[PDB]
Amino acid sequence: QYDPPTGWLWGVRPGEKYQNEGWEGPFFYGFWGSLIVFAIAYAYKPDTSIQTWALEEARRRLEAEGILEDPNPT
Amino acid sequence: MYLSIIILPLLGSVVSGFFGRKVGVSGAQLITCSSVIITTILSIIAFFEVGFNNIPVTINIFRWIDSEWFIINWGFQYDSLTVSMLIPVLIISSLVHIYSISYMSSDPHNQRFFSYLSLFTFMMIILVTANNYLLMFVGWEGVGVCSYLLVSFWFTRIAANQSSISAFLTNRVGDCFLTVGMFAILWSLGNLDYATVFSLAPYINSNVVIIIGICLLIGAMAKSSQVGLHVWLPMAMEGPTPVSALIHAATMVTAGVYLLMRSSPLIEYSSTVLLLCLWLGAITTVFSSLIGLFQQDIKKVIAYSTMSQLGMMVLSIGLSSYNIALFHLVNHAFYKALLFLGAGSVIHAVADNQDFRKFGGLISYLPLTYSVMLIASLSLVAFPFMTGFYSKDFILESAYGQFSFSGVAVYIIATIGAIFTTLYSVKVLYLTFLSNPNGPRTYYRLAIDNFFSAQAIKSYKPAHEGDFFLTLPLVILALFSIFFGFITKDIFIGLGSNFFVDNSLFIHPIHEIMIDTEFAVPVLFKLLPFIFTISFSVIALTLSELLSELVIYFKFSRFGYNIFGFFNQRFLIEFFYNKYITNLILNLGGQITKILDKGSIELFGPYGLERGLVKLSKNISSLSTSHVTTYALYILVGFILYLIYNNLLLDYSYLLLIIILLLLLMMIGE
Amino acid sequence: MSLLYVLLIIPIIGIFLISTIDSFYFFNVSYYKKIALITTILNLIVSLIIYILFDFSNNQFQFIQENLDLSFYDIYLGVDGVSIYFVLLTTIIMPIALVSNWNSITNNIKSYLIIMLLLETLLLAVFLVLDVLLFYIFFESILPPLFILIGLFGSSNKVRASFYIFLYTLLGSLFLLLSILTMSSIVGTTYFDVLLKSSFEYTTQLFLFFGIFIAFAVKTPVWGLNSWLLRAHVESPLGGSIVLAAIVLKLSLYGVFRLILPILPQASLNLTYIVYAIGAITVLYASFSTLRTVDVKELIAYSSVAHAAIYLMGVFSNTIQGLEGAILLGLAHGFVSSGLFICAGGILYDRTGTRLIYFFRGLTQIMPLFSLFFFILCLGNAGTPLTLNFVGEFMSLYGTLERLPIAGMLASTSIIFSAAYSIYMYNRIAFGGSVSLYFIDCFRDLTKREFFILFTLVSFTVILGIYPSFVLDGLHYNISSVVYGIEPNASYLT
Amino acid sequence: PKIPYPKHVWSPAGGWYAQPANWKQNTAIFGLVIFGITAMVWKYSAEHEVRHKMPEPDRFYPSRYWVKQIKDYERAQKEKQ
Amino acid sequence: MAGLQHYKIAMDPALVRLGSMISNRYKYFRWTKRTALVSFMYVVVVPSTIGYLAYKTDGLWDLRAKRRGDLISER
Numbered sequence A: 001q002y003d004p005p006t007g008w009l010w011g012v013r014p015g016e017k018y019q020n021e022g023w024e025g026p027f028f029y030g031f032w033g034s035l036i037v038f039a040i041a042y043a044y045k046p047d048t049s050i051q052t053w054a055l056e057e058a059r060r061r062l063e064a065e066g067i068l069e070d071p072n073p074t
Numbered sequence B: 001m002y003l004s005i006i007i008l009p010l011l012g013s014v015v016s017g018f019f020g021r022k023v024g025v026s027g028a029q030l031i032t033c034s035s036v037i038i039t040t041i042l043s044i045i046a047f048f049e050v051g052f053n054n055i056p057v058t059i060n061i062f063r064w065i066d067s068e069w070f071i072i073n074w075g076f077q078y079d080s081l082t083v084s085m086l087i088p089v090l091i092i093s094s095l096v097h098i099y100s101i102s103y104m105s106s107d108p109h110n111q112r113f114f115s116y117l118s119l120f121t122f123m124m125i126i127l128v129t130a131n132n133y134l135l136m137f138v139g140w141e142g143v144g145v146c147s148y149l150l151v152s153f154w155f156t157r158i159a160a161n162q163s164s165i166s167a168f169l170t171n172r173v174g175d176c177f178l179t180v181g182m183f184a185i186l187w188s189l190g191n192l193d194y195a196t197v198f199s200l201a202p203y204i205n206s207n208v209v210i211i212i213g214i215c216l217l218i219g220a221m222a223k224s225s226q227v228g229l230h231v232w233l234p235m236a237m238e239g240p241t242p243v244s245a246l247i248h249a250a251t252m253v254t255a256g257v258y259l260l261m262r263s264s265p266l267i268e269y270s271s272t273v274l275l276l277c278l279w280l281g282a283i284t285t286v287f288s289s290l291i292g293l294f295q296q297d298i299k300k301v302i303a304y305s306t307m308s309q310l311g312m313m314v315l316s317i318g319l320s321s322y323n324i325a326l327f328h329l330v331n332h333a334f335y336k337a338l339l340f341l342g343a344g345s346v347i348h349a350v351a352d353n354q355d356f357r358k359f360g361g362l363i364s365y366l367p368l369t370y371s372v373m374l375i376a377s378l379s380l381v382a383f384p385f386m387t388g389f390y391s392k393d394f395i396l397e398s399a400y401g402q403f404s405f406s407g408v409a410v411y412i413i414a415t416i417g418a419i420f421t422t423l424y425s426v427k428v429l430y431l432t433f434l435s436n437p438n439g440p441r442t443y444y445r446l447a448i449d450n451f452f453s454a455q456a457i458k459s460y461k462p463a464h465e466g467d468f469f470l471t472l473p474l475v476i477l478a479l480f481s482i483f484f485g486f487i488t489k490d491i492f493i494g495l496g497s498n499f500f501v502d503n504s505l506f507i508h509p510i511h512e513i514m515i516d517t518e519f520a521v522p523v524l525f526k527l528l529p530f531i532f533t534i535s536f537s538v539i540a541l542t543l544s545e546l547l548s549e550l551v552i553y554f555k556f557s558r559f560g561y562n563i564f565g566f567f568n569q570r571f572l573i574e575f576f577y578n579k580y581i582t583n584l585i586l587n588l589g590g591q592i593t594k595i596l597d598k599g600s601i602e603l604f605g606p607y608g609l610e611r612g613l614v615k616l617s618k619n620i621s622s623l624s625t626s627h628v629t630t631y632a633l634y635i636l637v638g639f640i641l642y643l644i645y646n647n648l649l650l651d652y653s654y655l656l657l658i659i660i661l662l663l664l665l666m667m668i669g670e
Numbered sequence C: 001m002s003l004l005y006v007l008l009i010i011p012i013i014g015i016f017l018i019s020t021i022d023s024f025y026f027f028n029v030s031y032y033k034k035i036a037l038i039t040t041i042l043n044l045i046v047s048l049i050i051y052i053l054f055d056f057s058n059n060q061f062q063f064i065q066e067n068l069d070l071s072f073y074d075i076y077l078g079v080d081g082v083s084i085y086f087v088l089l090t091t092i093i094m095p096i097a098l099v100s101n102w103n104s105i106t107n108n109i110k111s112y113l114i115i116m117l118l119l120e121t122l123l124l125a126v127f128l129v130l131d132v133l134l135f136y137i138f139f140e141s142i143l144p145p146l147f148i149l150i151g152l153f154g155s156s157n158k159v160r161a162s163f164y165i166f167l168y169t170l171l172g173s174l175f176l177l178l179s180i181l182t183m184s185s186i187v188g189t190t191y192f193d194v195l196l197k198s199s200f201e202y203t204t205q206l207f208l209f210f211g212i213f214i215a216f217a218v219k220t221p222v223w224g225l226n227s228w229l230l231r232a233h234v235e236s237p238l239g240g241s242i243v244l245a246a247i248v249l250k251l252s253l254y255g256v257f258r259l260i261l262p263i264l265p266q267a268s269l270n271l272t273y274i275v276y277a278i279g280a281i282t283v284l285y286a287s288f289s290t291l292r293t294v295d296v297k298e299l300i301a302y303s304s305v306a307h308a309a310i311y312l313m314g315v316f317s318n319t320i321q322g323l324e325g326a327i328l329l330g331l332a333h334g335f336v337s338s339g340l341f342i343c344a345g346g347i348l349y350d351r352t353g354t355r356l357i358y359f360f361r362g363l364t365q366i367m368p369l370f371s372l373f374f375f376i377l378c379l380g381n382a383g384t385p386l387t388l389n390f391v392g393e394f395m396s397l398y399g400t401l402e403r404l405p406i407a408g409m410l411a412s413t414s415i416i417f418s419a420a421y422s423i424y425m426y427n428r429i430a431f432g433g434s435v436s437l438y439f440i441d442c443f444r445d446l447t448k449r450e451f452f453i454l455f456t457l458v459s460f461t462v463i464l465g466i467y468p469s470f471v472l473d474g475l476h477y478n479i480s481s482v483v484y485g486i487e488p489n490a491s492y493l494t
Numbered sequence D: 001p002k003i004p005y006p007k008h009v010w011s012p013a014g015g016w017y018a019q020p021a022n023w024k025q026n027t028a029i030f031g032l033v034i035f036g037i038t039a040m041v042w043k044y045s046a047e048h049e050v051r052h053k054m055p056e057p058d059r060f061y062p063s064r065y066w067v068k069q070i071k072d073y074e075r076a077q078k079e080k081q
Numbered sequence E: 001m002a003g004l005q006h007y008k009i010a011m012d013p014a015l016v017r018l019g020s021m022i023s024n025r026y027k028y029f030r031w032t033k034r035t036a037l038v039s040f041m042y043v044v045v046v047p048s049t050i051g052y053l054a055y056k057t058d059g060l061w062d063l064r065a066k067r068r069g070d071l072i073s074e075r
């Protein structure tokens, strides 16, 4: 035998509904909201890290030797 | 498939634990078992795909940590060794999830318990699938956290709280050494990815390899319970029995063994660490086996028995033959998951009780439960032509095969540990099934014998056995303890087997001793462990139920009483630990908070300045009497002092000393 | 109006609206709290816009606005990699600090919000100013608002606490001011772009180093100069404590990058064995001491001391890894210590009215959401992997070990004791028997507010713990500029 | 017997003896969510697995059906004569 | 007791008295033979020992790309 799932989420008794203190508006839409929007813009952000700029130069400089193979020789 | 083996236990653990309200108790059991079984099956295929056809599979997902030289990626790599260790890990985990369907049926926290068991499997799989040391260490810390949460599962019990802190902190000591070890890899090689460390291993400073090698052995020492850091594994038997079987007897304890085996292409070039591998593993065999003989708890005897098998793997690592250690790790895991799960039936059988001094009868009450022990016991003591025979009775021979003082000495040590191995094996078997009933009559009261008059339907409790879910893993594990050892002995031993030509494990040609093991060893020493095993069983079997009083005579002497307790108190490597290590730190913290922080640093600091300056401030103000005649005198004296200083060409140091004096006197009252 | 100047202006507009809205509407207190929260949200939104436009590999200060109307004391703002993430951490933390006190102030709410909003403008100004005197002016400007915050809204011993944090900081800063004035006299200017170009003589660098280090040691704090933290961080209001631990501790760390690494490299190299002895001592003495601390917030306050020693050892490693680890650990400690103070000072202290650990037991039985987040924050405080705390600790400790192995090993031992004190506290509160018999009333679990200021903090540490590249990508080129040394065959190309 | 437990405590793991009347239904929806991610992961692992050795045609290597690296090799290797 | 009403606790007088003694203990520290030695061990000797070892071994080693036939000792 098993019990039915019980418990009050956020302390709200089964009779009533969660009351809003006024922080929910700005926090869920201004704070988190802008944090998802920023995340979307970050996917489209150009990549300006020093590493990828350096790997491209490191590649050619390695292609001048026998370590790597030139896709477009000469 | 290769990456599905990764996420499937993770998903199963997330849904069961974070939505146990939604799927309920049975919903959680359905997902964790299904996700682990589907994952288990895919590993079996991966064994064929990778081990048998020799295709190592590289899978790199995205960079984890990228700083200049360190490029640690969430990369996974399948080779022969990681699929070797994934087989027992998934198989016993499948059998432990299924086994727990019954063991925890009365527990009020089933969803949480099954969530933990699937997270540990995910952390074990991450540990062995990683292609670098840093990502491996995540699973290393992962199984440690999963071990802590599963020991403390009954968190209202104070003694199981102390156990989980012992599990967490003792292992954390090992991880500090391991963390330092990865620093030494990073410092010398630029990164800590496997294909780099082992590509450059034969070429780096020998002293570096010792610095490297020692560190991860200490980390391996903590996670496999070696004589130094070994106290968590038996304390870790405060968790539910399947946790003891899965995490503390067959999978995680074998992480330290796995670390040395994956690092074989590196530590091979350091005999100093390899020699330290040998004797260390040799020591913990007699250390563990002796203590286990004098343990009253069934699980606590078994904990000492795991520590012994792992010690023989650590021993085998020192013999430059890591494949045999790999052979024993898989073989030991099955017999062990058998021994504990079947043991759990015994505790579930009578009263949730596990003390030897109140066990007896039960040979007919639990026929199947007894049978699986005997298969497991003989596999553990390496009875001829069994699963443990092909692994345990090959390490000992390998030690003589290396003809040196270290190789011969550890033989003697291991054989003595092997001698004491069968005694607790006998003690477990005899005192629970083949002995007189030492428990209350409630355990042994069948409805066939008329005892009660009215309450005949109930009040019997005749120590019944378990349901299907409890016995299906018991039967399945029995076959692995008979036929799996023989079937796979050619993959892992063979004569010139090429199962590891992908370099997964590495053996240097100068360190090979396997040829002498098969031929140079003398027949007498090859069959010597069997002679002791089949002999010392009869003395133990004759010392009980036949003589039964020679031992008590030894017990009540002064020599026996001191020996018995010493071995029962586990060599006292926890009394000096608790008092001279743990409480030393606690007193060091006490002294610093009470003498310095709440003490001298306040007196030789803000509090002293506040005391003194208020005193100094009040004395100076007392000279302000508002007596106009007294003020006139002060002006004149200040006038005279300024004339002296400038007219007499005074040293400035005289002036400053005078001011310091005037503060000193003013600092003094009256 | 540069984006950087927008950052300093929004919180000042919020102060204006907070203190004038009653002339346009008895206004409700909820209004003030909503003005203040939205104000910090728009400041976060602007800092996110800046980060999108920010370029990861530029040696020029970015988003600078030309003044050209030179005066004696002008405010120039600019941002590069080393300052960009401290600015983001300040803008993320302060909204969480505002919500963490939504219900627990109940008096002088206007004063609390104005002080909190002013602190945001000052702390942001610290990370954005392009002048060493400008740096000092903002590093110290926060003391009077900090002094009055503790005294207005602090606990029973808030008088001794507010004095300690004011006088410690001033006394140390006065020694930093002396060092800063010597620099401006020799160079004629404290502007970054021209002061870093200069070269100080070794003994000048030596005496410049003591003056600056005395201030940075009071603010780290180092062990033995940390009485103020024990008092202030505990007696402060919860929002104050979050700002004090997650932002104010970082000013000395960011100040090491702008005041000693570029101009005092010889002094830093020749004195590392003194910094490391103090750093090693702080790691052990603090760790042992917090193991015996009985006030839950003081235990969590004392943990900050131990971790601050680890990233203090990193910044003096002269290695790429140590410096990146130091910023990443300082950022990681900002989220995790903020969560642990909300757990202690916000969740436990509001239910019980006490912070003694003796009174807590078995809280998991009635409060499984608190324990779930508390454990994840106790793991992060122990440096467990998949938290940004591990990536920072490992990189910071690797640099410490490589620069000087004896200090690295000792600082490494913190892997044991951080775990030790973090898990031991966790068990005496969440585990370790059934619910404490001292509780007469039963307790409720996390409110929606408490759940979402913890979920937010544990999300930041975990996501950054799995992909720290988000932060490391914008530190690689700028961190490179502060390294001092040369390779035998790469130096002096021709 | 079952130990008494507070009814006011909400735990996401379900609590003391939680089993909702709709447990079978929810266990199916979550399984589907679990299945789809694995399919998403399987598609990833098929695309990005790397192997420097190719399995022989006769051997039991069930991955040749769904991985791209082997399928491209076998497709190209079929062109003989 | 505080500004915001909390739950009713069984505020044990003994534990309350213990937590006040700790907060007030700094006022009662005194210089004695014991307190001078402990305060001199922790503040001077042990730190100066680490400083001695750190000073003496600064630059003693480099592990970077070290090979056989090449030592770790740098000085």
Ligand SMILES: CCCCCCCCCCC(CCCCCCCCCC)(CO[C@H]1O[C@@H](CO)[C@H](O[C@@H]2O[C@@H](CO)[C@H](O)[C@@H](O)[C@@H]2O)[C@@H](O)[C@@H]1O)CO[C@H]1O[C@@H](CO)[C@H](O[C@@H]2O[C@@H](CO)[C@H](O)[C@@H](O)[C@@H]2O)[C@@H](O)[C@H]1O
Binding pocket: B180, B181, B183, B184, B207, B210, B211, B214, B215, C401, C405, E060, E061, E071, E072, E073, E074
């Ligand atoms: C967790 C480690 C577990 C334990 C494993 C230890 C394994 C052994 C390593 C020991 C080690 C590694 C550094 C450890 C820390 C580095 C990074 C830390 C860990 C990074 C994670 C520390 O050795 C140091 O010890 C110092 C003691 O003072 C010495 O410094 C100086 O001492 C005085 C002059 O010798 C000065 O007067 C004093 O001014 C210095 O101070 C040096 O011996 C050396 O610097 C290096 O040991 C090696 O050093 C070299 C040179 O000796 C030796 O080579 C030999 O040299 C010829 C004559 O020697 C021999 O003819 C020749 O045959 C051979 O070629 C080796 O044989 C071995 O000894």
Ligand SMILES: CCCCCCCCCCCCCCCCCC(=O)OC[C@H](COP(=O)([O-])OCC[N+](C)(C)C)OC(=O)CCCCCCCCCCCCCCCCC
Binding pocket: B013, B014, B016, B017, B018, B020, B108, B109, B111, B112, B115, B116, B119, B138, B139, B141, B142, B143, B145, B146, B149, C364, C365, C366, C367, C368, C371, C372, C375, C376, C379, C380, C384, C385, C386, C387, C462, D009, D011, D012, D013, D014, D015, D016
């Ligand atoms: C590194 C920081 C964490 C990163 C990962 C964050 C979580 C990722 C997913 C983890 C797997 C899912 C875990 C679900 C656990 C069950 C749900 C639960 O919390 O129930 C609370 C349960 C409630 O379950 P309950 O249903 O039994 O509650 C009612 C009964 N009482 C209240 C009496 C218990 O509370 C507890 O009893 C335990 C308190 C501590 C909870 C810790 C749970 C694990 C948290 C994640 C561990 C992550 C390990 C990371 C390892 C790092 C490796 C380097």
Ligand SMILES: CCCCCCCCCCCCCCCCCC(=O)OC[C@H](COP(=O)(O)OCCN)OC(=O)CCCCCCCCCCCCCCCCC
Binding pocket: C008, C015, C019, C110, C111, C114, C115, C118, C121, C122, C125, C141, C142, C144, C145, C148
């Ligand atoms: C970028 C460079 C910026 C340079 C500075 C520019 C200005 C910065 C702010 C300086 C002071 C501004 C004060 C703003 C509030 C003024 C409006 C006001 O009247 O607020 C009143 C408020 C509540 O009082 P009330 O509502 O009237 O009474 C209700 C009783 N039931 O009562 C209060 O709000 C008082 C709040 C406590 C005091 C403020 C915090 C301590 C400040 C110390 C002042 C000295 C240091 C100044 C530092 C400036 C910034 C560095």
